[PDB]
Design an enzyme around this catalytic site. Structure first.
Site, PDB file in Angstrom:
ATOM      1  N   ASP A  44       0.506  -0.812  -0.224  1.00 43.69           N
ATOM      2  CA  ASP A  44       0.238  -0.197  -0.268  1.00 43.69           C
ATOM      3  C   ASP A  44       0.535   1.161  -0.077  1.00 43.69           C
ATOM      4  O   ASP A  44       1.627   1.309   1.029  1.00 43.69           O
ATOM      5  CB  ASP A  44      -0.654   0.167   1.240  1.00 43.69           C
ATOM      6  CG  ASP A  44      -2.018   0.588   1.600  1.00 43.69           C
ATOM      7  OD1 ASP A  44      -1.652   1.787   0.785  1.00 43.69           O
ATOM      8  OD2 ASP A  44      -2.966   0.475   1.923  1.00 43.69           O
ATOM      9  N   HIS A  90      -8.983   5.240   2.226  1.00 42.54           N
ATOM     10  CA  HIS A  90      -8.481   3.426   2.068  1.00 42.54           C
ATOM     11  C   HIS A  90      -8.724   2.648   1.025  1.00 42.54           C
ATOM     12  O   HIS A  90      -9.384   1.647   0.644  1.00 42.54           O
ATOM     13  CB  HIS A  90      -7.597   2.870   3.278  1.00 42.54           C
ATOM     14  CG  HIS A  90      -6.790   3.319   4.360  1.00 42.54           C
ATOM     15  ND1 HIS A  90      -5.510   3.233   4.327  1.00 42.54           N
ATOM     16  CD2 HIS A  90      -6.953   3.871   5.487  1.00 42.54           C
ATOM     17  CE1 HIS A  90      -5.115   3.808   4.928  1.00 42.54           C
ATOM     18  NE2 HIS A  90      -5.853   4.110   5.976  1.00 42.54           N
ATOM     19  N   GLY A 110      -4.231   6.425  10.232  1.00 41.59           N
ATOM     20  CA  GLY A 110      -4.095   5.856  11.201  1.00 41.59           C
ATOM     21  C   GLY A 110      -3.779   4.227  11.969  1.00 41.59           C
ATOM     22  O   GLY A 110      -3.591   3.460  12.900  1.00 41.59           O
ATOM     23  N   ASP A 158      -7.570  -7.292  -0.598  1.00 42.53           N
ATOM     24  CA  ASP A 158      -7.698  -6.445   0.634  1.00 42.53           C
ATOM     25  C   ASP A 158      -9.008  -6.313   0.899  1.00 42.53           C
ATOM     26  O   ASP A 158      -9.960  -6.833   1.615  1.00 42.53           O
ATOM     27  CB  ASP A 158      -8.186  -4.435  -0.636  1.00 42.53           C
ATOM     28  CG  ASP A 158      -7.917  -3.855   0.217  1.00 42.53           C
ATOM     29  OD1 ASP A 158      -6.911  -3.754   0.935  1.00 42.53           O
ATOM     30  OD2 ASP A 158      -8.448  -3.057  -0.383  1.00 42.53           O
ATOM     31  N   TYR A 174       2.589  -7.476  19.009  1.00 46.03           N
ATOM     32  CA  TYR A 174       2.541  -8.472  17.877  1.00 46.03           C
ATOM     33  C   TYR A 174       2.289  -7.757  16.834  1.00 46.03           C
ATOM     34  O   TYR A 174       0.684  -7.676  16.652  1.00 46.03           O
ATOM     35  CB  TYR A 174       2.197 -10.009  18.438  1.00 46.03           C
ATOM     36  CG  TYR A 174       3.135 -10.932  19.064  1.00 46.03           C
ATOM     37  CD1 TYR A 174       4.061 -11.573  18.775  1.00 46.03           C
ATOM     38  CD2 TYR A 174       3.156 -10.593  20.012  1.00 46.03           C
ATOM     39  CE1 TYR A 174       5.147 -12.523  19.340  1.00 46.03           C
ATOM     40  CE2 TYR A 174       3.930 -11.875  21.354  1.00 46.03           C
ATOM     41  CZ  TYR A 174       4.975 -12.497  20.780  1.00 46.03           C
ATOM     42  OH  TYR A 174       5.822 -12.984  21.326  1.00 46.03           O
ATOM     43  N   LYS A 230       1.595  -8.159   8.352  1.00 44.97           N
ATOM     44  CA  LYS A 230       1.742  -7.727   7.502  1.00 44.97           C
ATOM     45  C   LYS A 230      -0.288  -8.502   6.635  1.00 44.97           C
ATOM     46  O   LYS A 230      -0.521  -9.198   7.360  1.00 44.97           O
ATOM     47  CB  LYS A 230       2.263  -7.330   6.557  1.00 44.97           C
ATOM     48  CG  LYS A 230       3.140  -7.364   6.537  1.00 44.97           C
ATOM     49  CD  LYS A 230       4.276  -8.208   5.468  1.00 44.97           C
ATOM     50  CE  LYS A 230       6.335  -7.471   5.537  1.00 44.97           C
ATOM     51  NZ  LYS A 230       6.924  -8.123   4.470  1.00 44.97           N
ATOM     52  N   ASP A 231      -1.102  -7.566   6.424  1.00 43.41           N
ATOM     53  CA  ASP A 231      -2.208  -8.203   5.911  1.00 43.41           C
ATOM     54  C   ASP A 231      -2.430  -8.261   4.074  1.00 43.41           C
ATOM     55  O   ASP A 231      -1.280  -7.750   3.423  1.00 43.41           O
ATOM     56  CB  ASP A 231      -3.379  -6.914   6.065  1.00 43.41           C
ATOM     57  CG  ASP A 231      -3.396  -5.356   6.194  1.00 43.41           C
ATOM     58  OD1 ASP A 231      -2.397  -5.242   5.521  1.00 43.41           O
ATOM     59  OD2 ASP A 231      -3.907  -5.067   7.514  1.00 43.41           O
ATOM     60  N   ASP A 232      -3.939  -7.895   3.962  1.00 44.30           N
ATOM     61  CA  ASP A 232      -4.007  -8.076   2.870  1.00 44.30           C
ATOM     62  C   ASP A 232      -3.115  -8.981   1.590  1.00 44.30           C
ATOM     63  O   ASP A 232      -2.099  -8.526   0.875  1.00 44.30           O
ATOM     64  CB  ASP A 232      -4.123  -6.142   2.113  1.00 44.30           C
ATOM     65  CG  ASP A 232      -5.012  -5.447   2.503  1.00 44.30           C
ATOM     66  OD1 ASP A 232      -5.504  -6.118   3.314  1.00 44.30           O
ATOM     67  OD2 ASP A 232      -4.357  -4.171   2.574  1.00 44.30           O
ATOM     68  N   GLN A 256      -4.179 -27.681 -12.797  1.00 48.18           N
ATOM     69  CA  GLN A 256      -4.468 -29.106 -13.438  1.00 48.18           C
ATOM     70  C   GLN A 256      -3.475 -29.475 -13.160  1.00 48.18           C
ATOM     71  O   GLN A 256      -2.235 -29.965 -13.004  1.00 48.18           O
ATOM     72  CB  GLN A 256      -4.246 -28.064 -15.274  1.00 48.18           C
ATOM     73  CG  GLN A 256      -5.254 -27.118 -15.289  1.00 48.18           C
ATOM     74  CD  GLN A 256      -6.920 -27.071 -14.861  1.00 48.18           C
ATOM     75  OE1 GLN A 256      -7.509 -28.336 -15.443  1.00 48.18           O
ATOM     76  NE2 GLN A 256      -7.221 -26.403 -15.296  1.00 48.18           N
ATOM     77  N   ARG A 316     -11.140  -0.789   9.801  1.00 50.16           N
ATOM     78  CA  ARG A 316      -9.890  -0.388  10.325  1.00 50.16           C
ATOM     79  C   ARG A 316      -9.050  -1.801  11.053  1.00 50.16           C
ATOM     80  O   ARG A 316      -8.512  -2.097  12.509  1.00 50.16           O
ATOM     81  CB  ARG A 316     -11.010   0.220  12.036  1.00 50.16           C
ATOM     82  CG  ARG A 316     -11.281   1.664  11.421  1.00 50.16           C
ATOM     83  CD  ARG A 316     -11.712   2.261  12.244  1.00 50.16           C
ATOM     84  NE  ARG A 316     -12.487   3.217  12.096  1.00 50.16           N
ATOM     85  CZ  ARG A 316     -11.930   4.534  12.063  1.00 50.16           C
ATOM     86  NH1 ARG A 316     -10.411   4.395  12.443  1.00 50.16           N
ATOM     87  NH2 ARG A 316     -12.045   5.548  11.603  1.00 50.16           N
ATOM     88  N   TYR A 362      -7.275  -1.817  16.331  1.00 50.98           N
ATOM     89  CA  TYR A 362      -8.257  -0.728  16.694  1.00 50.98           C
ATOM     90  C   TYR A 362      -8.162  -0.341  17.964  1.00 50.98           C
ATOM     91  O   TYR A 362      -9.160  -2.291  17.897  1.00 50.98           O
ATOM     92  CB  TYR A 362      -8.646   0.318  15.694  1.00 50.98           C
ATOM     93  CG  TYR A 362      -7.355   1.180  14.222  1.00 50.98           C
ATOM     94  CD1 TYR A 362      -8.132   2.497  14.608  1.00 50.98           C
ATOM     95  CD2 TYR A 362      -7.658   0.124  13.234  1.00 50.98           C
ATOM     96  CE1 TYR A 362      -7.470   2.687  13.689  1.00 50.98           C
ATOM     97  CE2 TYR A 362      -7.237   1.253  12.577  1.00 50.98           C
ATOM     98  CZ  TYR A 362      -6.902   2.509  12.160  1.00 50.98           C
ATOM     99  OH  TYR A 362      -6.729   2.783  11.160  1.00 50.98           O
TER     100      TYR A 362
END
Ligand SMILES: O=C(COP(=O)(O)O)[C@@H](O)[C@H](O)[C@H](O)COP(=O)(O)O
Ligand SMILES: O=C(COP(=O)(O)O)[C@@H](O)[C@H](O)[C@H](O)COP(=O)(O)O
Ligand SMILES: O=C(COP(=O)(O)O)[C@@H](O)[C@H](O)[C@H](O)COP(=O)(O)O
Ligand SMILES: O=C(COP(=O)(O)O)[C@@H](O)[C@H](O)[C@H](O)COP(=O)(O)O
Ligand SMILES: O=C(COP(=O)(O)O)[C@@H](O)[C@H](O)[C@H](O)COP(=O)(O)O
Ligand SMILES: [Mg+2]
Ligand SMILES: [Mg+2]
Ligand SMILES: [Mg+2]
Ligand SMILES: [Mg+2]
Ligand SMILES: [Mg+2]
Ligand SMILES: [Mg+2]
Ligand SMILES: [Mg+2]
Ligand SMILES: [Mg+2]
Ligand SMILES: [Mg+2]
Ligand SMILES: [Mg+2]
Ligand SMILES: [Mg+2]
Ligand SMILES: [Mg+2]
Ligand SMILES: [Mg+2]
Ligand SMILES: [Mg+2]
Ligand SMILES: [Mg+2]
Ligand SMILES: [Mg+2]
Ligand SMILES: [Mg+2]
Ligand SMILES: [Mg+2]
Ligand SMILES: [Mg+2]
Ligand SMILES: [Mg+2]
Lengths: 359, 359, 359, 359, 359
Positions: free
Chosen positions: E10, E17, E102, E130, E224, E227-229, E237, E261, E343
């Site tokens: 990002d 976002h 944020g 996402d 802890y 990353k995301d997305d 096959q 969030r 958050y």
């Protein structure tokens, strides 16, 4: 005397048995463009449905013509070469028995052809499907030409009161029988209700024996295997089913054999050209319908028949039924009967459990 | 040591293959009341599902006991006599090969029996269906005892982590094989996915071989014909599927073979006792589920399992799917494959068209 | 030789043309109870559908018997007297031409009768409707006895392959024609598709001419007016449509003529006995179906056929279609064609505007 | 003084009575482009709905002008010649009585014209439909100009309180009557509720007799046959129905006569320009709506009125109702009454069965 | 030996976002175009899903290559500079710990890479999402490679009978375990059922250890956080799941952690490229699927997998479920468990109420 020839074949596809790549159709076009220039064919239209490249050609060389078929074969060969260079999946699938894919390969192109004498106006509808077999057209054809609840012309149009007769092919025995409607409809249904064995190959009007429809179907071969992803040509109007009566026969997305690994029953989904690709579970089976007018060997059109709001609920029902069927997993009736499955591990399983089975 | 025996048979029904007449069950009750008084059986509950009279009995005479079965036979005989006097349709259907009906007659009562050692508490669910065959329970049983998406206990209950094994009967060969889950589920599914040939007859817990379920199924006979309208007993809780996990396996109204003239696929519809009757198209196939607690040979209950709002959408979906299937008319997959149809005119049709078929 | 006679008539109703009052049926019962005691009839069942009192009687006096009909008339007379004393609306409606109501009065009872030789078992379904006319049964009967997509027995039951023939009555000319199915279905449909002119009165099996069904319909009279709220008797099983095939023909709530003021088209709604009353817009048209077994002149039953979950979606669709039709207000096709309207102000309007119409 | 003339005709279509081919409209454009250059007309817009070519023209030559109509005829002739060369179906359909098609041919172009004095601003909505008849606009017009539940302006706009009057034409007698709303609405409805006999031809505002709407309708001819696929012009705003009130009258897809073979009732489906083509069962009937502003004989626009999400549910309901109606097959009310069917075999059937009908 | 590297990050988005601005992708393209020219990579495709810029690259430098990753980093840097100049929101979000946003910033690009030996044909499906985390792919992958109700090939394709094994990473401990299916599926599910702790990182075919799939997931870090997305690459096959079997695993829009969030559970919505943007409640989570064929390091394609009608009901269900979940407001299970919320104000609240809590 004009011949309408619809010849299709799988020569490879992008990301799986998903869609025909534009570049392969471009190669096929160069070949037919040359054939047209040489006078072999009078006109043509190339498209696809799922992973099947479609060659719609009009000419004056009759049915089962060596040169027309050879032209089609060369078109597919050139398309397959591009597919190979592009590293597409199952490149040359229907042309080479050892092509890179796990399904039935090298059986050759499927064909639907009708040599006719053009009427004052010759409107026709051409249907092409992916992920199903020839028998898929049994129910639709029966409705188009024999069901008075589908085709009111049979009841209110004097020119159609005589009815139609069906040439039903026993795909195993290699023999065909002619059954007339209406008085033999119960006999007819007793047969065509089993699409894997009895398939309607041609339809004729009773009063004058006018050829009205043709389906791509040939007897099975022992290598018992046969081609799939069928095409069909239907002549319309003036004593024959109206375009709307032919389309009415597809308003109901009936369950057809095929779909994933040619081993399931799934709803036939009528779609627009842009939606003619296999996705969820390698389907659902897709049906493309194109309307044309044949004038002196020329193809006027096409008009995308199912790309219309009148079929939106047909498609929604297909999606709903698709989900319902899928919840059955590998169980019949979602999975096909044992002998009809294109893929199977049963022989190997029984071999492995031969000594574990107790009397 | 207690034996739970569910023996059912069609001895006639009102207005067609619709519902068991109360008077016939009253006759059956007098017989079992006497058997209980004589000490032959310890307890019983009589009911019906569609045109099938159900005899649920608990006793201490083990499986396949001559006296218990003879008692059941006499109960059905007395019920059949009342059916005959009332002029009911198919009077004595499953008892007499020449009873007045057009379906398969005189095959005898269907049976599901399990001799067990009652646990501290012995909760069980008994399922009885009309208008389908034994294989109808293949999908539900697989889900109950092997599918972690149906029975979370397999994943989160330490006492069930070991899994279960299935005794699968080849109804044609008359041989059975034991397959364990989880590691043989792909093999298992390759077989039970074909309900007409491979049927789960019993289920055992792997860790201690505890018998957990039994289905009414016997090898086919050549007169290849077999009994239908199956019953099943499932032991619940404490290391075995919870009542809710067994019921979860029926939340999806899957397509089962049977329905009209034992020649179609239709959705299994879980219903309350009052709704346990065949109507539209002689169905849809009906499933009755009764919960009991077995205490010292006594039957505490029952509680009507599917007579609850949690299954209202299951039934609505069954009705929607029923309509969808019916629009297929006499075409597969709504109509069963040729060799599985209880009724057929194909042999006669081919005979009539033998000389009309052309090579 | 047993005769099944269904004779109905409107003798008054509570709060409008809504429902038959229990007290009036009690009066009718005393009369039939006496007739049974006297041996005039062997058995009977009295009920209602909407504002129509139903007399189902079995006897051995054949069709159109003076004493049986006179017995029915006295039953209605006694019911009408109670209706009058209770001040019910339209008291004696169908018996007195000057009864207090605005619709067609004094035409007499409607009748459906069939004298037959009881088969080993004689299962039958009796259908009674309110707020529609005899032609309402044309579509259902055609499906039951000629449509292979409704009755698979025609295709898969050897005993039904021969088909059925229909006695179609021209209600205006007072002449009837026999048309056989399957080979004359297009001719048949060209006629029965117009329920106000051509009505199926009886149905016979082709192979042995066995009488299978009868509808209450008589030629029109010029006072052109005729009776409404029809009844029908259908013989079932063993070579005749199964109960499920007869019920399958009513799974679709088709639009029928009648409803409010006998001047609209509305969906036929199959209902249970408790729901057999006219409400919204004096309907929708209600259909009651009762199953019986006739044994030596005795009526075993009935079983309320449509009081089952398999018809819940049929009823929901009827309600949805009812709302849709109602949004048309006094416009065709919701309103009937000019000459078919039981109520009309057209003659008076044209008279009032005769000089305002300009050439 | 400006005249808005909407003249349409079927001069042939692709693959059946499906859609107007672009090339034919191009030919029509050359003709009108010349007429505009010559000053015969001031402006024009050409489009289509189904198989009907639409000529929207503005000029100052008044209603029923020979030169304007002759210009339209030449436009259609040139379009028909292209249709013929392209071998389209029904080439010259409405122009030649012997054109190649099975429906009513050679009746000539349909016309809707209104000569008016442009207001400060002259907003109008033009509606064109395929597969239905003029009476299809009866319900919509009644709602637009007389129903307070459709047009609140009648109740809350002082300038509309006076109401509107309708010129109703008896298409058989060839006479028209003027009925005013509100006080004659019951009389009005008694007539226009029968669209095949009484059709609203024009609408006027009561207070000043301002012409507000015109429908294409002419008395029937005995060859009793008349033209179909109607057009309508509605003047909007400032004391006349708002665009939104006119569109509100089409929010409900009412059943209209026509559809397949001009012999059925089907829901009117409001569609965008791209969806203005007949498909399923040669329909459902399609309605195109175009908004314009007329300024000094010029056509500003159009704006595709129904190509908007506010009509998505209208179309979905049309599809749902279409399926429901189709399940009726050749039965009324889906099939039209005997005398209104454009196609029929009844005369021939009765002739064939004249000796089989028994008294 | 070819390596397929999908690296995303990002670097800023328009209006929130919401979506990647085209200008930023253009900057990224210049960088990869140069890298390709320099021979660092062989081919690439750049796109986005929500606010995540996607870099799909093929090369021969293996997994975790410094130069390839540095190239990706420079591409993102150039994109971030454009984002900054355009004043986009969260410019450089994943690259700078102090970027203007944020949420969790500066963690770096997410990566999914697989070095393989191209098969005769190498069809692959790349999935990018996402507003969710890596564990979102646990359910889909389990279905694709272990669920016989999703992938019938496991049961009917001999080449897949051996099954697949999963490399499950404990994101907290930083350790991975290999579990094989089928015999360890209950163990597998006990772990992957908790997506926040156990994530499937890679999948291998049991018979030959062929790498079949890779997911972007790395152990958590204490700052802890992780990353995301996520992105995922699946080989298709010829012994591996068919494109249709991989897509079948996404037909059900399951609830995944993330959405608004990064603190809620919401349905994963498969969308076309044009619909790959976050809107309602910053979602619902979006899933983009692209099909390619890898040929000698070249990327043939892509084909937008979910931009097809077969997924229309999947999306509608996602919207319905989204509304349902949203009615829960800030309550679990719509809101994530305490420790999983990106958050939270809980720490501050408890601090504020420390003296108000009473024992
Ligand atoms: O039916 C199908 C294609 O048939 P066609 O449309 O190509 O005839 C597909 O469902 C394939 O069987 C499936 O992708 C597996 O293909 P494979 O990995 O074994 O190569
Ligand atoms: O399957 C059925 C009953 O099977 P059971 O439930 O009795 O086993 C029914 O569908 C019958 O086949 C049908 O009514 C015809 O019965 P028939 O007129 O030929 O006597
Ligand atoms: O069709 C109907 C009853 O017909 P039947 O069911 O009684 O034959 C009703 O719809 C009546 O026409 C309506 O209530 C008006 O009755 P009325 O106020 O004029 O007396
Ligand atoms: O109503 C229709 C067209 O009417 P128009 O829209 O052309 O007026 C269609 O439904 C036709 O009747 C039908 O295709 C048969 O046409 P035909 O094969 O007999 O030529
Ligand atoms: O999850 C989200 C974006 O995560 P990414 O897709 O960027 O990883 C969004 O839901 C944000 O948390 C939300 O807009 C608040 O962003 P903020 O006003 O605090 O800057
Ligand atoms: Mg392929
Ligand atoms: Mg294909
Ligand atoms: Mg195939
Ligand atoms: Mg193929
Ligand atoms: Mg029975
Ligand atoms: Mg039974
Ligand atoms: Mg049976
Ligand atoms: Mg049975
Ligand atoms: Mg009344
Ligand atoms: Mg009545
Ligand atoms: Mg009446
Ligand atoms: Mg009446
Ligand atoms: Mg036309
Ligand atoms: Mg038209
Ligand atoms: Mg017409
Ligand atoms: Mg026309
Ligand atoms: Mg962001
Ligand atoms: Mg993001
Ligand atoms: Mg985030
Ligand atoms: Mg992110």
């Amino acid at each position: 005397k004009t011949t309408i020839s619809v010849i299709k074949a799988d020569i490879g596809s992008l990301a799986g048995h998903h869609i025909v790549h534009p570049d392969t159709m471009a190669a096929a076009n160069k070949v037919l463009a040359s054939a047209k220039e040489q006078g072999i064919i009078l006109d043509y239209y190339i498209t696809h449905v799922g992973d099947d490249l479609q060659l719609i050609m009009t000419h004056t060389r009759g049915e089962l013509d060596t040169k027309v078929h050879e032209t089609a074969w060369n078109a597919f060969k050139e398309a397959a070469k591009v597919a190979k260079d592009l590293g597409l999946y199952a490149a040359g699938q229907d042309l080479l028995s050892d092509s890179f894919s796990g399904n039935v390969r090298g059986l050759g192109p499927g064909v639907a052809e009708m040599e006719i004498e053009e009427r004052a106006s010759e409107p026709i509808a051409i249907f092409m499907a992916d992920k199903t077999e020839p028998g898929a057209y049994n129910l639709p054809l029966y409705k188009m030409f024999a069901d008075p609840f589908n085709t009111p012309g049979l009841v209110i149009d004097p020119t159609m009161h005589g009815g139609f007769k069906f040439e039903v092919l026993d795909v195993y025995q290699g023999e065909a029988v002619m059954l007339s409607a209406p008085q033999e409809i119960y006999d007819l249904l007793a047969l065509i209700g089993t699409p894997a064995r009895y398939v309607i190959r041609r339809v004729y009007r009773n009063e004058d024996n006018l050829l009205a429809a043709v389906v791509s179907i040939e007897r099975l071969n022992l290598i018992y295997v046969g081609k799939d992803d069928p095409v069909m040509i239907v002549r319309l109007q003036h004593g024959l089913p109206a375009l709307g009566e032919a389309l009415e026969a597809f308003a109901f997305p009936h369950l057809v054999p095929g779909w994933m690994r040619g081993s399931h029953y799934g709803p036939l989904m009528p779609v627009s050209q842009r939606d003619a690709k296999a996705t969820r579970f390698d389907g659902p089976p897709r049906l493309l319908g194109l309307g044309f007018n044949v004038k002196n060997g020329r193809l006027v059109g096409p008009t995308d028949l199912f790309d219309d709001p009148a079929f939106d609920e047909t498609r929604r029902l297909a999606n709903i039924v698709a989900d319902y069927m899928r919840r059955h997993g590998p169980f019949m009736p979602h999975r096909l009967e044992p002998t009809e499955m294109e893929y199977t591990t049963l022989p190997l399983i029984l071999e492995k459990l031969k000594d574990r089975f107790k009397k």
